[PDB]
Structures are given as C-alpha cells and as structure tokens.
Amino acid sequence: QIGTKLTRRLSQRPTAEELEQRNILKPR
Amino acid sequence: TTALVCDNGSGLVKAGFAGDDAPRAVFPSIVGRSYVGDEAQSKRGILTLKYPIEHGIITNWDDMEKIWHHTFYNELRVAPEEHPTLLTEAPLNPKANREKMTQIMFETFNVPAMYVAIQAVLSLYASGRTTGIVLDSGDGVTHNVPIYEGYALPHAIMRLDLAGRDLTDYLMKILTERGYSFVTTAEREIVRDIKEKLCYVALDFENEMATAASSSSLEKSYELPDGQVITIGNERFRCPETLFQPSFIGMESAGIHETTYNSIMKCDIDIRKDLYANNVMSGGTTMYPGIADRMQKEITALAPSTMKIKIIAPPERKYSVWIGGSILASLSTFQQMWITKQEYDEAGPSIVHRKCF
Numbered sequence A: 001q002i003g004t005k006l007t008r009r010l011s012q013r014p015t016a017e018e019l020e021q022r023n024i025l026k027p028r
Numbered sequence B: 001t002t003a004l005v006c007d008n009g010s011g012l013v014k015a016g017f018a019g020d021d022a023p024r025a026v027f028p029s030i031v032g033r034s035y036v037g038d039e040a041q042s043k044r045g046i047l048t049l050k051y052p053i054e055h056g057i058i059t060n061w062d063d064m065e066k067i068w069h070h071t072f073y074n075e076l077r078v079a080p081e082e083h084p085t086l087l088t089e090a091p092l093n094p095k096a097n098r099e100k101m102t103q104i105m106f107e108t109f110n111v112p113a114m115y116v117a118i119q120a121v122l123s124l125y126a127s128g129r130t131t132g133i134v135l136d137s138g139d140g141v142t143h144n145v146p147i148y149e150g151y152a153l154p155h156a157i158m159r160l161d162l163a164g165r166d167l168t169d170y171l172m173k174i175l176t177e178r179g180y181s182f183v184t185t186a187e188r189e190i191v192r193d194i195k196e197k198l199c200y201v202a203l204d205f206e207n208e209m210a211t212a213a214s215s216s217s218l219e220k221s222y223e224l225p226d227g228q229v230i231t232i233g234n235e236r237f238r239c240p241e242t243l244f245q246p247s248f249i250g251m252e253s254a255g256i257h258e259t260t261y262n263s264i265m266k267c268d269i270d271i272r273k274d275l276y277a278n279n280v281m282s283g284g285t286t287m288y289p290g291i292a293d294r295m296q297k298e299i300t301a302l303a304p305s306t307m308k309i310k311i312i313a314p315p316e317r318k319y320s321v322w323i324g325g326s327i328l329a330s331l332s333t334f335q336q337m338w339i340t341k342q343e344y345d346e347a348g349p350s351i352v353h354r355k356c357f
C-alpha cells in the first residue's frame, strides 16, 4: 500500500539536525 | 483541484497530474529559436535547437521558462494558478537554482503552491521505501544516491557525467568502426533508436565477446530511414558495457558497480546493510535488459558475503521519478509540506530551503 505505508514511513521522519547529530547526515 | 507533477530531464520532460499511473506528456527538453518540444523538432530547419538543462542542472533560464509555459498551456492544457505544482531537481542542485525555480513558479506562473524534490528520492518513494541507494541514470547525468529516511546523504552522493547521450555517441563511434557512418545530429537520433531497441548488458562481458566469435547468434538487422539494412553484433552489449567500464570512452572513473559500492562505504556502518538490501534503479539508461542481473553480480562480488544484496528495477523504472512525485503529491499528509503562495510572499525564494528537504 505505497501511499499508506509511505505516509507512515514519512509520518515519523526525523529532522536533519538529528540525523546530523547521529553522524548520518554530513556536508559534502 | 489536482496537483501537477513535472520531472524536468536533460533529455525529456515528463509531466502530468498527480494520481495518474504515468506522465501524460513526455516530450524533448528542447527549445528552438519560439518553439518547444515536439513542435521544435518538426521545425528544426529554421529554428536553432538548444537543451536548457545540462547534466540535470538548469543552465538556460529563459529557455527553461519556455519549457514550463509549454508544459502548462500546451501539453497539460491547465491554468498554472489553479494547480499546486511539484517539480524535480538533481542531487546537489545549487542553492541558487532552487531559489530561481521557486521565484519563477510563484512570480511568473502564479502557482498556488509548489514543492521541489530530488529525483532519486522520488524513485525511492515510488518503490514504497524511504531508505535505500538509488542508481538514477537518464540522458545527461548518472548519480548514486544513498538516502536515509528521505534524506539524500550529500557527502556520499556520486555524480558521473556518463549517461544516455554519451552512450549514444559511443555507439555511433563503434558502428562507424564496422564500416557504417553515423555522425550528424539526425544520424545520432537513428543511433539512439538502435540503442533503445537492440542494446543489452552482458552478464559476463568477456564471455559474451567470446560468443560473438563462435557465431553470429547475437546479430540483429536494423532498417535505416533510407531503406538500407545494417547489421549490429557485439555493439549491442559493448555500448552499455561503458557504464561498467568508463575507460571505453576514456573516462578515468570507476564503473557504476564500484561507484555504488564506494557510495555505500562512505555511509555510516550501521546503515550499510539497509543500503545493500535496497538498491533501486531508475531512469532511461537503466532500461537495458540484463542490467539488474549484472549489477546484482558485480555488487555481490564487492560486498561482504555476509551482505544481502537486492536490486530493485521495476518495468516502469524509466518513469519512477515521475511516478514517485505522482504518489507523493497525492498524499493527504503531504499537503502541509507544499510551499504556499502566502508563505512565499512572506518569506521569499529562500523558503525552498526550509520547506523542501
């Protein structure tokens, strides 16, 4: 159920700041 | 009202209405000076043709405006002020470019709302995922894009200026070695068609080459517009082999299998597993028969044997970017994410950076 499931996976999307804090999101 | 989705490629514009299974308008991203898309081509010998988008980046803004105008009024037959509009952009698209797209959409076309998404991210969404690594390869540019919870990870993105148009040029070169002659713009279009209809990726390149020996079992005939019939043999798979061996056209770059591996290895140790298991391919240049199986084989050879490898390459993947946008723009909970005209008037073009991520 793409729309529904994607909505759910997109529902609890983390912020950029917290991905950065976890060393996942890094600048080039 | 209904949302519009436009995926502006270096080669082709894909445009349509959110909720549709496919873009209803697919036309060449060209302006001839005046004339746009398919009308431009038919009037080529009077106008001067140009591609406003180069390697996925908008470079001619005056011509880009012509493309968008033609998309709304002539292809989709809509008034843009009546429709929220989702646009796409390349990974690593400069900040200024995102601002200019936003400014034009609101100030020139008066859209009630808009959003801009990274093409590879939409490909991933179309497969029902928010985490994975996408190989997106079109006419003008190829990217490896690792994505975690919707966020492309910029430090690990790989850009490769080898894509469809380059493969067409290479096929012209090697067919010309077999005694034929393909040189002109018009002749390049013939070769693009040959490429799309007859090329494939060999599972074992050297073995396939050896097979082009034992026989002519790989040979296909192709009728040219003038009625001459030519024969294509190992060129069928030598052409897209270039993606795995860019040295074929003199590039120093590693092939798409290695750049996929290198991209994953730049990411956090604990997400590598999730990237290996969710390799999505999208774009016209991923359409070669055999490409998914070959990628599976090459990635398996580079990755730890402890790693589950999965290549996701659906039949409709030429349009997965558009389809992802169609899905996203139709979501009830996405409606809060649009940049509204009101927010734009209050904040100006820089709004795109805090709203579109």
Ligand SMILES: Nc1ncnc2c1ncn2[C@@H]1O[C@H](COP(=O)(O)OP(=O)(O)OP(=O)(O)O)[C@@H](O)[C@H]1O
Binding pocket: B008, B009, B010, B011, B012, B013, B055, B056, B137, B138, B139, B140, B141, B142, B163, B164, B165, B192, B195, B196, B197, B282, B283, B284, B285, B286, B287, B288, B318
């Ligand atoms: N069946 C096919 N086999 C091989 N190549 C194909 C096939 N179909 C389309 N292509 C190639 O895909 C390219 C265009 O696809 P696509 O629409 O994904 O590019 P684009 O979005 O305009 O470009 P880009 O994303 O690089 O800016 C062309 O080079 C085209 O010849």
Ligand SMILES: C/C1=C/C(=O)O[C@@H]2C[C@@H](CC[C@H](C)/C=C\CC1)O[C@@](O)([C@@H]1CSC(=O)N1)C2
Binding pocket: B010, B011, B012, B027, B028, B029, B030, B041, B139, B164, B165, B166, B168, B188, B189, B192
């Ligand atoms: C049939 C369709 C294919 C497409 O991918 O077309 C795009 C856009 C097109 C623009 C010029 C061309 C003459 C217009 C019509 C072709 C459109 O150029 C491309 O063909 C170029 C030239 S050859 C190369 O493979 N990509 C790709």
Ligand SMILES: [Mg+2]
Binding pocket: B008, B009, B010, B119, B137, B138, B139, B283, B321
């Ligand atoms: Mg594209």
